[PDB]
């Protein structure tokens, strides 16, 4: 069972696997956003809109975490390094 867990940990930490996991989550987020903008919405958001809202909030938390875990040490320099990537 230890080689199986080692294979799972080695697979899921590969950069290509992480990129394709993030991409297949993006292409399942975009369809949910398409569904919530095409169909009408009620007074409260539906399940798919809650998933889209959760994706946006966790992505925003991830972008603040990329601001914090950067290369410089002073906050303005961290933001200035992060703003070079326009995307």
């Amino acid at each position: 069972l230890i080689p199986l867990g080692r294979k799972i940990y080695e697979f899921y930490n590969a950069p290509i696997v992480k990129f394709w996991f993030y991409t297949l989550a993006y292409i399942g987020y975009l369809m949910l956003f398409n569904y919530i903008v095409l169909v009408k919405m009620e007074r409260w958001p539906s399940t798919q809109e809650w998933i889209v809202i959760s994706y946006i909030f966790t992505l925003g938390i991830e972008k603040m975490r990329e601001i914090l875990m950067s290369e410089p040490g002073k906050l303005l320099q961290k933001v200035k390094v992060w703003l070079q990537e326009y995307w």
Binding site: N34, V37, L38, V39, K40
Partner: protein
């Protein structure tokens, strides 16, 4: 079989790959405009 039409046909077959990449970029821009237009102009729609 013809000496001019034959190279023309495989030339078309070679430009199909560049055509496919143009189709991919046009597809992204096309569904972005289509989804935005349909989602703005038709707010109350059932799943169909």
């Amino acid at each position: 079989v013809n000496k001019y039409l034959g190279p023309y046909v495989m030339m078309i077959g070679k430009m199909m790959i560049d055509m496919m990449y143009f189709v991919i970029i046009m597809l992204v821009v096309l569904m972005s405009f289509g989804v935005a237009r349909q989602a703005i102009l038709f707010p109350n729609e059932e799943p169909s």
